[PDB]
Amino acid sequence: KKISGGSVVEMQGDEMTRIIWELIKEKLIFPYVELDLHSYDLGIENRDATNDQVTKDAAEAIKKHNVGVKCATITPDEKRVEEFKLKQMWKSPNGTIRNILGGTVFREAIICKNIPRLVSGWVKPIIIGRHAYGDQYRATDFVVPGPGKVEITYTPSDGTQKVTYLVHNFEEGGGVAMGMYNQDKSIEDFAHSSFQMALSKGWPLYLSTKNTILKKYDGRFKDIFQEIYDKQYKSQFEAQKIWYEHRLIDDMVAQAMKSEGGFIWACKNYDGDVQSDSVAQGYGSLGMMTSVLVCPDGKTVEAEAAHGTVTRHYRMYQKGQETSTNPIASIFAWTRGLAHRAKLDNNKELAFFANALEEVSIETIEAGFMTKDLAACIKGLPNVQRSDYLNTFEFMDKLGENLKIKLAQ
């Protein structure tokens, strides 16, 4: 019999992931779960034929039904215009979905006992939440060709005095300057999503800033987090035996390095962008990392794999050659989206399914069945032999059958 799974927006995507995506639904999901499924094809073909409007449609569909699961999509560049004869160099679907939904993106590992990390001691997930707006990413930067002054000026709407600050007087030669900003409302959303994510996963939360030097800019993030914590989350944190602390970024990267893991780490835009590439690598393959967008509203979530379409593997797949692409990240996109769906609907049976699929995936790996990327974590890439791993399809077949066995009890 089939579990009543509810409403979910489903976004098909490109290349290697698209093939894996279909295998996941066919073999892992639809056999066990009936869904009020709203599909939008964000394949690059159907994106061009609708002028990116299927993307905006899907973002709004997530806003309406609250749970989005998305396959990796090609982000058009020049090479990709030539490739598909694209009418316009369309923007990142993730950029467009983020911008429409708001929210913070959090990256959580999938951890298996028999797969060594690069940071030996990481035994639990370090979940980085990256504040997705402003700072360096909406900066206004320029070359300073020669002598002159760079000033920054605030002009109040309430009539009162314009303020002008000298940033630097270039007396000889030139250089470089920029302005950047953040927005109180965005910082509050970032805060809300981080507090909520910590309360739902059951881990403490740390915020990193550099407020020792950026006393006003970063002080603001620190103040906003503290004041939201105090008036809206503190007592749930203590009832759950969790805490919230602000840290200096220099202390935090050191603490994360020495940690066992088991915490949420809210990062500023740039720090999240960098520190999450470090942490993912410290865990191992990107095939073991999801990327989940969590809106401030408590309700709306969008889940994907942290990696891309895996073009290189797709090229070999197009040539009739062997592939071993890790599907775990795509699977946990499904399971983590489904678990959130189940939390919204109070659906014990769906929560039970999502968790059992995670367990089947981990157990199957723990038993010796794994893709090449994972075999390389054990032996070192130069020593992997063909008998150490399964191809993509053998691995999915195995997971599909172990799942079936696990679901019978």
Per the annotation, where are the binding residues?
A: 73-75, 80, 92-98, 107, 130, 210, 250, 258, 273, 277, 308-313, 326
Are the CB atoms for 128 and 267 separated by under 8 Å?
A: yes
Give the residue with the Cβ less far from ligand NAP, 265 or 395: 395
Q: How many CB atoms lie within 10 A of CB 64?
A: 11
Residues 6+ apart with CB under 8 A from 217: 182
Q: Which helix (H) or strand (E) holds 9?
A: strand 3-12
Q: Does 4 bind ligand NAP (CB under 6 A)?
A: no
Q: Does 325 bind ligand NAP (CB under 6 A)?
A: yes
Cα maximum dimension of the chain? 78
Binding residues for NADP(+): 73-75, 80, 258, 308-313, 326
Give the residue with the Cβ less far from ligand NAP, 94 or 300: 94
Lay out the site mask for ligand NAP across 70-109 (x = CB under 6 A, - = otherwise). --xxxx------------------x---------------
Binding residues for substrate: 75, 92-98, 107, 130, 210
Listed residue (100, 178, 171) closest to 140, CA to CA: 178
Give the residue with the Cβ less far from ligand NAP, 7 or 281: 281
Which partner in ligand NAP, a copy of itself, Mg ion, none is near 311 (CB below 5 to 8 A by kind)?
Answer: ligand NAP
- The angle at the Cα of 328, spanning 370 to 112, to the nearest 5 degrees, equals 60
Are the CB atoms for 252 and 206 separated by under 8 Å?
A: yes
Which partner in ligand NAP, a copy of itself, Mg ion, none is near 158 (CB below 5 to 8 A by kind)?
Answer: a copy of itself
Are the CB atoms for 206 and 263 separated by under 8 Å?
A: yes
Q: Site size for Mg ion, by CB under 5 A?
A: 3
Among 10, 189, 271, 373, binds ligand NAP (CB under 6 A): 373
Q: Which residues pair with 265 in a beta bridge?
A: 128, 206
Are the CB atoms for 361 and 332 separated by under 8 Å?
A: yes
Lay out the site mask for a copy of itself across 97-126 (x = CB under 8 A, - = otherwise). -------------------xxxxxx-----
Q: Which residues pair with 305 in a beta bridge?
A: 290
Instruction: Round to whole Å and give the CA distance between 165 and 183.
Output: 20
Applying CB under 5 A, which residues contact Mg ion? 250, 273, 277
Binding site residues, ligand NAP, CB under 6 A: 72-75, 94, 285-287, 304, 307-312, 325-326, 329, 373
